Amino acid sequence: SNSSVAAPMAFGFPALAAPGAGTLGISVSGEALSAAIADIFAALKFSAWGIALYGILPSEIAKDDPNMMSKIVTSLPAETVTNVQVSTLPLDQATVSVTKRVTDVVKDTRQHIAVVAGVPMSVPVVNAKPTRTPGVFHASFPGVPSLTVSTVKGLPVSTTLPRGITEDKGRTAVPAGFTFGGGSHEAVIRFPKESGQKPVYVSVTDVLTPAQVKQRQDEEKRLQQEWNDAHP
């Protein structure tokens, strides 16, 4: 009974979106990344480090999503995550190098959305295709079979966090660990040249249940111990 497309969030602020017949629908406006978010990102300066941005409380998310169908979606202007001119990459290239990613991390037996950087990394790059509805483009990328993006430039944007997602305080970077991104799927989405729309980076994260978080936390601990023990 929700609409087919979510209202637009300011870039860097997450929305909860659920699929309608397998398709997630999101929207983006045309305001720049807020200085606040840009500053947390600038603080991230041979292993990846990350700064937690939002905490996830699955039991709180369940109050508005009892069947746990919603994903956490965060979007950024693509220039925020890469300096590559993506429109000029070869037609057959599936990925693009990035300087940072917004993806999930598990620490202290809790899931968070963090910005991570520090080592060479890429994400899939795909083309959004035009549809029969003005301003709505359709994309498909690894882990997200169907996503529509509505380019609603001019509309106001929201920074209000939905129940179950909280703002993490602090800008201190911590090692990213071993399983970062385990619950996320990201891509840089390119729009038709005729549209005039600049590419957008989208990160879609699964809301992990307490059982899933514990499993990942246990995996993180084990991989860390193995790494520790395998040093000279």
Curated annotation (Swiss-Prot):
Coiled-coil boundaries: none
Function of the molecule: This plasmid-coded bactericidal protein is an endonuclease active on both single- and double-stranded DNA but with undefined specificity.
Family of the protein in this entry: Belongs to the colicin/pyosin nuclease family.
Name recorded for this polypeptide: Colicin-E7
Originating species: Escherichia coli
